[PDB]
Design a protein around this ligand. Structure first.
Ligand SMILES: Cc1cc2nc3c(=O)[nH]c(=O)nc-3n(C[C@H](O)[C@H](O)[C@H](O)COP(=O)(O)O)c2cc1C
Ligand SMILES: Cc1cc2nc3c(=O)[nH]c(=O)nc-3n(C[C@H](O)[C@H](O)[C@H](O)COP(=O)(O)O)c2cc1C
Lengths: 130, 130
């Protein structure tokens, strides 16, 4: 028996304020809410990096997140350009997702960057975690 | 013969400036480019309703697009609120697409709508046209 289908494309995305300190989340779409397990009120105003800790309670990023990719994200955000890579993330229930992630900055009335759009493509993964 | 595959999700979206008049396009991702046929230079600065017109040389929207839904969009934008609905549009090469469109607006530093994001889901249709 088939229902409770989704009508659109399953694309997950987030928007951040590139004006306030440290890219706070101002918008998540409900595909994000439904793949990650985090509701929008849980994540508004927070930086996206909680996805790199495994669970809602863990406060340090997981060892197997590639500290080099995360470094490159930081470069791109800072140099005002597009990031594109793949990075271990974690659902609220603990499960691992390879996040095939793309960051695109948006300019306002200026030549200043006012927002960044983030497009997650979470992929299931059988990474051994201990 | 298994090549030139998309690596992420076939997700299509567009961003416009809500400050300048008539919501001009400031960004389009390459899935939009690839589906609709319109290259990003062609469309930058223009308003999106050209998708309602069949081909790049048509001057008036095609009769078959529900002007009752076009009306609903204008209302939503004007009230600074989200829009959601389905709508006939056309590739550059003329073929018809049913566009399952979602419009979600974005706030800036002055709690005021600075951009709008439109996510397009372009479905093939066998509609008869003329
Ligand atoms: C708009 C946006 C979306 C992001 N989405 C994710 C994400 O889904 N998963 C993730 O691991 N990091 C994501 N990040 C990256 C972090 O927010 C952060 O910028 C990165 O972890 C580097 O900074 P840090 O080393 O100080 O943590 C996103 C960043 C931005 C700006
Ligand atoms: C961000 C954004 C994306 C839009 N994308 C589309 C689209 O893909 N297809 C479409 O037919 N209309 C789209 N529209 C709507 C038209 O651009 C226009 O706003 C609408 O036709 C209502 O105005 P009008 O009756 O004055 O033409 C979009 C609008 C916005 C703000």
């Amino acid at each position: 028996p088939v229902g409770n289908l989704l009508h659109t494309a399953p694309c997950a995305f987030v928007v951040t304020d590139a004006v306030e300190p440290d890219q706070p989340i101002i918008y998540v779409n409900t595909v994000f809410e439904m793949v990650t397990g985090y509701r929008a009120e849980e994540v508004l105003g927070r930086n996206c990096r909680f996805l790199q800790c495994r669970g809602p309670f863990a406060k340090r990023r997981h060892p197997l997140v590639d500290s080099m990719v995360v470094s490159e994200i930081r470069k791109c955000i800072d140099e005002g350009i597009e990031f594109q890579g793949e990075l271990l993330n974690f659902r609220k229930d603990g499960s691992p997702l390879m996040n095939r992630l793309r960051l695109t900055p948006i300019y306002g009335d200026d030549d200043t960057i006012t927002h960044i759009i983030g497009i997650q493509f979470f992929i299931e993964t059988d990474i051994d975690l201990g």
